[PDB]
Structure formats: C-alpha cells, structure tokens
Amino acid sequence: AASGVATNTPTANDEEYITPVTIGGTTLNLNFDTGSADLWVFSTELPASQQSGHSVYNPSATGKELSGYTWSISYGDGSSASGNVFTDSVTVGGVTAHGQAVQAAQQISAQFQQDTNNDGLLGLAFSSINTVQPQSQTTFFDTVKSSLAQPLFAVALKHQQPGVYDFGFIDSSKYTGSLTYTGVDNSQGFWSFNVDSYTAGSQSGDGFSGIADTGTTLLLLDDSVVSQYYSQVSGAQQDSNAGGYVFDCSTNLPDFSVSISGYTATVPGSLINYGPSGDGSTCLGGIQSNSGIGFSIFGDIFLKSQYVVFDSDGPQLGFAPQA
C-alpha cells in the first residue's frame, strides 16, 4: 500500500502554502486546496507573457488530451480561470496518480496572473464538485485513495515554517493528545462539519457549520461574530485595501475557539495577528467576514492551530492541537 509526505511551505505572512507536484515529469508549485475539486495548472497554452515567472505544464510531451472537454471556475472576488483537459502522471509526496486529469489553463484572471508564488491549485475537496465538462473528473486524492494504506490525508500548516500533507497515514507526532472526530456532510462537495458553540474572547455564542479549507488564507465567520471579536480589540478598524479589520501590531488579541464534537479547537490570539496589513503601519486580523454566505470558512489561520485528518471513511474530520 502507498502513503507519502508532501511538504508544504508558506509564502510571506502565510498568505498561501505551496507544495511541489510533478506532472508529466515537470515539477510545479501548487496551492493544495481542500475547498476545490479541480487540479488546474499554468500551461504552455497560456500567452507566453502569462507564463513568465511560473513553471508550466506542457501537455504536448506527455499528456493524453480529453478532446472536447473544458473546465472553468469563477470566484466571488471576481477571479476566474478556464481551459482544457489532459490526463497525465501526477506525483505528490512520492505517491503517483496515473491517468490523473490535469486542467490546463488557457485563461486566467489578474489575481492569478499576479501571484507568481504558485503555478495552479490541487483540489482535495470531494470529486462531486469537480468542474470538468462534459464528464467530471476525480481529484488526485480520489484517484489514489484505494491504493493508499488508509483512504485519508492529514494536514499540518504552520506559521512561517514548513508543514506537511500526509497521504495515506496519520502522523501522531504532529499533534498533542488524541484526535477527536466529527461527521462530515459532503453534500456540497466540501469537508463540512458542525460546531456546537464558539467563544470569541469574552463572548460565547451559538454553533454553526463550516468547511475545512486550506485554500483560504483567513478564518471567515459571520459578520456578527466578527463584530463581537473586534469589539474587544482596541482601535480595530476596517481597511478594504488591507482585506478587512486591522489594528496596531502590538495589540493583545483575544483567543477564538469552537467546540467540535466535545473537543475545543482554540486559535490563540497570537495566530490571529496575520501580519503587516500592507497599508501603512497596522496588522491585519486573521478573522474576517464570510460575506453573508451562512457558513464559516475554516481557512489557514485556523488550521495553523490544529492537525486535521480528512478521512474518506465516514467521511469524517479528526482534530487535535498542533504539535
């Protein structure tokens, strides 16, 4: 049976985490995203000017084209990308998926062009939400899942240090104590789970649902919860240039936690100071608005505090404090 450890590395301020992936023999630095079921890459089909500053997939040499197939993704921030599809060999952490669908980019919007830190995204959400037309494809994980020793992956994202994606086994040295599991609702293709309550500093409130999403930088919560959190942060104010609420970098931030199946997942206030806001001399808050969507996005700020097991058996998520 297979397993492997793929090492991830955060970019500045942990805006994203990149992990190398060898496709048809070329290694690309991809953003692993548990909130997406697409594996899309910068490719030789983009205009040459858009290829600059990236490693790019060249399908002509090794890929098998799925003639007539397309893909396209659109985000609420206004970003988008689209293209065609080839199958190829895709290796992550020493685990190879043969015949894996690779969505080659033909078009990408400004946000993607501007980020030279990654060459695309590798999706780890459920395959039911893969965007390939006319017949959807399986994610890297779903492709290799039955070959793994256990049909799961796990992740340790860290603050300014390398982390791991463990495929096919659990590394118990990556957390303190025992894992606590909770059921996953995959009906929207996400690793969605329920929280029974939250505590934002001095205030506690009702539970809600959310999704474990490595592809989102911050922890996105309902506006009401965000307001209660920042009401406790002296001088906090919104700055749309920065991304939301910002505050003096020396501020002592409250912790934020959620109760999941009896386990308290605590994000220490230190991890809620994302870093320099990039708009003068303030720091950006790790907690921000989910913009009214009615469910929470447990992005990197939250994940940095935990080791999280994504188990297809259930399916279910396991959590414990990161060690």
Ligand X SMILES: *[C@H]1O[C@H](CO)[C@@H](O)[C@H](O)[C@@H]1O
Q: For the chain, how far is it from start to end, CA to CA, in angstroms? A: 27
- Residue 162 binds ligand X (CB under 6 A): yes
- Residue 5 binds a second copy (CB under 8 A): no
> Which of ligand PP6, a second copy, ligand X, none sits in contact with 188, Cβ below 5 to 8 A by type?
a second copy
Structure-block tokens of residue 70: 């397309």
Closer CB to ligand X, 20 or 276, in the complex: 20
- C-alpha to C-alpha distance for 151 and 146, rounded to whole angstroms: 6
In the region spanning residues 2 to 21, those forming contacts with ligand X, defined by CB under 6 A, are 3, 5, 7
Give the strand pairing for 287-289 and 219-221: parallel
Closer CB to ligand PP6, 3 or 31, in the complex: 31
Cα radius of gyration (the chain):
19
Binding-site size for a second copy (CB under 8 A) equals: 23
- C-alpha to C-alpha distance for 310 and 266, rounded to whole angstroms: 19
50 phi and psi, to 5 degrees? -80, -15
**Active-site annotation holds for 213:** yes
Per-residue x/- marks for a second copy, 12-51, CB under 8 A? ----------------------------------------
> Using the rule CB under 8 A, which residue among 70, 150, 199, 266 binds a second copy?
70
Task: Name the active-site residue from 33, 119, 222, 300.
Answer: 33
- Residue 240 binds a second copy (CB under 8 A): no
> Using the rule CB under 8 A, which residue among 75, 99, 114, 183 binds a second copy?
75
- Residue 295 binds ligand X (CB under 6 A): no
- Residue 1 binds ligand X (CB under 6 A): yes
CB of 160 to ligand PP6, least distance (A): 18
- Residue 169 binds ligand X (CB under 6 A): yes
- C-alpha to C-alpha distance for 152 and 312, rounded to whole angstroms: 6
> What residues line the site for ligand PP6 (CB under 6 A)?
33, 35-36, 75, 77, 79, 111, 133-134, 213, 215-217, 293, 297
> Which of ligand PP6, ligand X, a second copy, none sits in contact with 217, Cβ below 5 to 8 A by type?
ligand PP6
- Residue 292 binds a second copy (CB under 8 A): yes
- C-alpha to C-alpha distance for 268 and 18, rounded to whole angstroms: 24
Type and span of the H or E element at 50: helix 48-51
Give 229's contacts (C-beta < 8 A, 6+ positions apart). Answer: 200, 201, 203, 221, 254, 256, 285, 287
DSSP 215-269: T-SSEEE-HHHHHHHHTTSTT-EEETTTTEEEE-TT--PPPEEEEETTEEEEE-H
Q: Report the interface residues with a second copy, using CB under 8 A.
A: 67-76, 80, 82, 128-129, 131, 133-136, 188, 291-293
